Amino acid sequence: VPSSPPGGERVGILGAGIGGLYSALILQSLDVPFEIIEASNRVGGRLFTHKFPNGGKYDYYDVGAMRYPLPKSDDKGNYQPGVMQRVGQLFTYLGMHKQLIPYYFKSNKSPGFQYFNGVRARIGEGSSFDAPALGINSSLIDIGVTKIVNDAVGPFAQALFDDLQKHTTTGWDDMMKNDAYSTRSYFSFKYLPSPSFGLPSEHFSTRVINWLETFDKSTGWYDRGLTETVLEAIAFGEVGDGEVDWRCIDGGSHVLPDTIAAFLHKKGGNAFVMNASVTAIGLENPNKEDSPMVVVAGGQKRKYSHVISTLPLPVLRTVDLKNSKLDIVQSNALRKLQYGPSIKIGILFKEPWWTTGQDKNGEKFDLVGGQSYTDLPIRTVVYPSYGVNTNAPSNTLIASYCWTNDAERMGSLIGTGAATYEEQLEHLVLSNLAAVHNTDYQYLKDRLVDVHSWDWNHNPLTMGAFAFFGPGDFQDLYTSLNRPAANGKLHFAGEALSVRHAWVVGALDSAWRAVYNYLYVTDPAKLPKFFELWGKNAEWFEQP
Amino acid sequence: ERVGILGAGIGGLYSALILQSLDVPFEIIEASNRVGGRLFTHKFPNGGKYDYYDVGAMRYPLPKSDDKGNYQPGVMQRVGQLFTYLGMHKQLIPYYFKSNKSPGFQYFNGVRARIGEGSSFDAPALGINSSLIDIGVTKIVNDAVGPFAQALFDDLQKHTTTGWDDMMKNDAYSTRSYFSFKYLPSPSFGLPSEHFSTRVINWLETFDKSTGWYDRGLTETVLEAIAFGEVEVDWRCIDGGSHVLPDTIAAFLHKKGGNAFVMNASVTAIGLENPNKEDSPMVVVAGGQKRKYSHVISTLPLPVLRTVDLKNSKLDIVQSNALRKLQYGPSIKIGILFKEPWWTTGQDKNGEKFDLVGGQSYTDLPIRTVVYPSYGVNTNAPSNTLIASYCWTNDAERMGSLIGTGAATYEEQLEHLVLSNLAAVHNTDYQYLKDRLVDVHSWDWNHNPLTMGAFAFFGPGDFQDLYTSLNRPAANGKLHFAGEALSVRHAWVVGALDSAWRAVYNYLYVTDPAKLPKFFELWGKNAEWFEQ
Ligand SMILES: Cc1cc2nc3c(=O)[nH]c(=O)nc-3n(C[C@H](O)[C@H](O)[C@H](O)COP(=O)(O)OP(=O)(O)OC[C@H]3O[C@@H](n4cnc5c(N)ncnc54)[C@H](O)[C@@H]3O)c2cc1C
Ligand SMILES: Cc1cc2nc3c(=O)[nH]c(=O)nc-3n(C[C@H](O)[C@H](O)[C@H](O)COP(=O)(O)OP(=O)(O)OC[C@H]3O[C@@H](n4cnc5c(N)ncnc54)[C@H](O)[C@@H]3O)c2cc1C
């Protein structure tokens, strides 16, 4: 159904993701008419939860967002300052604080497994994983990958964390002076070990750098922007102050967009336009000063005063933006600003063998939540933290969670539609799970029930997992999209338009900035109420 | 004594030719029902003789040749000799890298021009100085890569390795980081003596190659400059599609010695029957049945080996990591069959004739590259098939998501996007092309379990740290790694030939060195070093 603009203002939100839904909450709280246009048959976008039909209450897994490193909170839903504060307040604003259950980043019982170079160990046993055979000095092994990488990113990350506390941008300025570096080129040409390590003051070799990447991140991560590596350290809480409180949503992250879709309806009506793929955006007349915006979605023209686009950048490259009058830098930013891939494989088993089972030698796994890591194709294993300590614990496992090259390669085995490749994938995954945990292949096969795989890099609605900028992207093209187009009536938003890529808070920040520019240009009288309800700044810290 | 060749690609078929010429028993194991691997030609069933297009290999920058199949020295000499060895010289028809008549189109930043008109494509609005625009991207990139390429080209002529040694000293650079931290423009350009900014570098990448290329190894950019002949080359393609090469080699093998192919057999495990016994054979679990061999030559792409069980192959720790870290690149192609060769005979919305015969058109729109058919021209039935899109790196990752969905709704979205971009690049109405469309065929090599990527595309440091590990054998010297990845001519057929040459060389060296003179005499004294 069509909406209605009291005062002549109707905002057209493109995309029913968390970014678009957040824009709706803000506009709805400010008595601004809006309309959400969604290409698919569902809302939530990359908050995608899959429920196995042959499972119980907690036999699901999040294909997209699953964990949230929130600041500490009281029992009433007030969150302390922090990177993810904006997310925590959104949960409280929707009455979801009681649904935020603990997420165990590390195993709540026995440590998770590490399996690299044929060497199997548990996290904390200080194993070398045969690094000496690779040529890694003995001094490096004793220091550790976590300690070395933290020393290189620390200075940058600390400066950005100071921007958030002290309300400055100098930290970003210094970061941008180094944005031309990839994480690799920074280690190869700039980084020098801290004197406290007792190492030679010299740059690392390729062998050492690839050794850092292996245990620190994913294959090919370090070839992308250094800026991304520092930002991901801040989001993960690797270099901050206040302790982080990992949380996930009871029932899957899909509860968040579902609750927001109900909140937006309880007041008035339904402002969603589903199954309508935006094919063109632009001013009705680019020369007229007060021309509205036209959004051709689902083959039907729709008029709006302003448009807030949460579409991922590769999708805008498929939309006709002729009459949107983007400048030459914004046009190029849509193409060059890089995205990253990712795949997830969820398997439903007959039992939570990882919690109660045992290996070939009788040793109990005793894993509750947490993760296991390996250099095998599956790279990462994530055990369910939801449903533990319940009548029906979860039988669902994330048998694979890959990034960058590991996701690009594995993706070819996903979504093929061929029976042969669905079985190859299953045998490969179980085989890697079998090696990582020290069990026979048949032990897991006898417990398999259903398999679900997803490749965000082959999804036409996202065209990539998330933004993952390469070197120089932030310093040359990011700013162009932070200002509007189409005579100020087209606002770019989405997780890509933020410094928290691959996080929900990034989508929220982009919506905040989009509404801020909208109110600033149409109804500045609402800025005080806007600041009071949604914050004075997107990112700079502030008390609840 | 019997060698097990894994993979019926051009690399495996070449290994078979060599072993067959040296009277060495072999057996080819192929997972699919076809031979040629990435030599993939698609024939539209509703088309004519030349209504096909090469999904993989399609063009070959061969050295100049006489009328009897003798090729002068050059990077692609080994390929030319293979065509002659198979009696295919008369089938090598011209390939037009540039339009054989009027130049191809360029469409960047909304500015449309023809190749050669020296358009700036509105670069001044991007901040590109007038001095850079006058010099040009081609002239700048050639100035930065020239030194490296010349040193490597001298290695091939003078038979040395000093050039490669110098290249490896700089392998830690990506092409981007080289411009940002080391490169200084030649004083002859009249530019400031300082490294290029990000804006300028992305401007170079936009017109020189594909989105995201410059984030990968500098070495790869230098090697691809040598393969393309940027150092004269005689571009050629195969009459009827590149599939003729593997098909012709399969016939050459079925007549002499009988058939020796094992099709529809997916290799799932490789290793010694007993890793402790000194003279243990190699076992290859293919199609669920064990097969014994004396030596195994694997042409499987590196990501595929990561899905094979190599427990009893006794790889060292560097080889294990090389399989994972050695990076591959993506690529997609979209071939469209039209009612007529409108690009050759049609006209735009303003009446101006396209007048395009062969060649290529370039744009910053999602399709990036358009390739017009050079095969079938000057025939009763010229080709009506167009390569509407040919992407690399990031352009392929994005487009790939719209390919292979299996859903009719999104296959039409893709078709509308492609035709719409073709409409803008050529200055025609969308309906002008739609009225002439007949069939569409798209392929995403980054979504294919038999390749798991288009080809090797190493990142910084891969050549200098991990490439060597896979060039030595495993499994007590009974497992030899081959394929285009194991070469310095990635994404080229000659690279697969070089890998096969080196694999056979090590095999003969360790089992029957008495055959090395015949091996050298028939297939060359070196994989890469030039010869007559
Ligand atoms: C594997 C993975 C794991 C993640 N894990 C976490 C985590 O643990 N914690 C966390 O905080 N974040 C996580 N994230 C990030 C989070 O999921 C995203 O950052 C956030 O959901 C992005 O929201 P958005 O609104 O910007 O984009 P999206 O959610 O992608 O929304 C875009 C919307 O636009 C629609 N659309 C697309 N094309 C069109 C079109 N042509 N016309 C109209 N509509 C269109 C889509 O269908 C979708 O509804 C993860 C992401 C991934 C990929
Ligand atoms: C888009 C594109 C364009 C190209 N264009 C050109 C060009 O213009 N000129 C040029 O010279 N080169 C070009 N190339 C390069 C050329 O096509 C390849 O370099 C060459 O064909 C690779 O041969 P190979 O034997 O190394 O691998 P492949 O041809 O991939 O052969 C591997 C074989 O192994 C099989 N196999 C896979 N998995 C298994 C398994 N588990 N068990 C058993 N068998 C298995 C495959 O089916 C295949 O038969 C191009 C490549 C691409 C992708």
Curated annotation (Swiss-Prot), chain A:
It comes from the Eukaryota. GO terms for biological process: amino acid catabolic process. L-phenylalanine binds at residues 67, 401, 502. L-glutamine binds at residues 67, 401. The keyword Glycoprotein applies. Gene3D superfamilies: 1.10.10.1620, 3.90.660.10, FAD/NAD(P)-binding domain. GO terms for cellular component: extracellular region. Coiled coil: none annotated. It is found in: Secreted. The keyword rRNA processing does not apply. Its cofactor is FAD. Changing residue 232 to H: Leads to a 2.1-fold increased activity toward L-tryptophan, an 1.6-fold increase in activity toward L-2-naphthylalanine which possesses an aromatic side chain of similar size compared with L-tryptophan, as well as a decreased activity for L-tyrosine. It is an enzyme of class 1 (oxidoreductase). InterPro entries: Amino_oxidase (IPR002937), FAD/NAD-bd_sf (IPR036188), Flavin_monoamine_oxidase (IPR050281). It holds the Pfam family Amino_oxidase. GO terms for molecular function: L-amino-acid oxidase activity. FAD binds at residues 19, 38-39, 46, 66-67, 278, 495, 503-504. L-lysine binds at residues 67, 401. Glycans are attached at residues 108, 137, 275. Homodimer. This is L-amino-acid oxidase 4. It comes from Hebeloma cylindrosporum.
